[PDB]
Structures are given as structure tokens and as C-alpha cells.
Design a protein around this ligand. Sequence first.
Ligand SMILES: *[C@@H]1O[C@H](CO)[C@@H](O)[C@H](O)[C@H]1NC(C)=O
Ligand SMILES: *[C@@H]1O[C@H](CO)[C@@H](O)[C@H](O)[C@H]1NC(C)=O
Lengths: 49, 44
Amino acid sequence: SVITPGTNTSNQVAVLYQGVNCTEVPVAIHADQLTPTWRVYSTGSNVFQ
Amino acid sequence: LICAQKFNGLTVLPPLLTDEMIAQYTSALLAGTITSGWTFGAGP
Ligand SMILES: *[C@@H]1O[C@H](CO)[C@@H](O)[C@H](O)[C@H]1NC(C)=O
Ligand SMILES: *[C@@H]1O[C@H](CO)[C@@H](O)[C@H](O)[C@H]1NC(C)=O
């Protein structure tokens, strides 16, 4: 699920992989491992379990 | 079990209001009723 303030405000968004202890597999997404692409956020701005 | 639903896409979304905050709301209601009568439910 994608957390967004609604285009209008800003195109900056944050995503939430529901129901996964993401401290292991999604925080360690390799090249194009995460579903929505943009592998630049492998660490991202912040990963908050 | 709850995990058994997590094999085939039957994800369970946790409630937004955790039981702790529900208890906090209930304690607030109880304190308001005890120390304020019914006035707090109709203004200050
Ligand atoms: C939405 O976009 C319009 C046009 O760009 C702008 O005038 C308005 O302030 C924006 N509102 C918000 C909440 O971003
Ligand atoms: C989530 O992953 C971390 C790192 O492997 C681990 O320490 C923790 O126990 C895990 N929690 C659950 C609920 O699986």
C-alpha cells in the first residue's frame, strides 16, 4: 500500500509492505527485488518496522 | 492458525487502534464520568 498526501500537495510518497517482518527480506531488496521498482530506496529515506 | 491464512493471500490487517489505546480511551471515559458527571459529555 502506498502512503500519499495526494498529488496536489506533493508527489513524494511512502510505501508499506503489509504483513511482512520486513527487517529481513524487503529491507534487503537487491536490484529490482521490491515490487514497485525504484531500487534506489534499497535503504530509502528510512525503513521503519 | 493466523499464519495459515498468510500462505494464500488471506492477510489479516491489524486494527488501527491498538488494544492499549482502546484501554486509554476507556480510562479517559471512566475518569471523565467519575470526576465530571455527565457535564464532560456536553461541553467542558
Ligand atoms: C493543489 O494544486 C493547486 C494548483 O496547483 C494549488 O493551487 C493548490 O494550492 C494545491 N493544494 C494543495 C493542498 O496542495
Ligand atoms: C523480524 O526479523 C528480525 C531480524 O531477523 C528478528 O530479530 C525478529 O525476531 C523478527 N520478528 C518476527 C516477529 O519474526
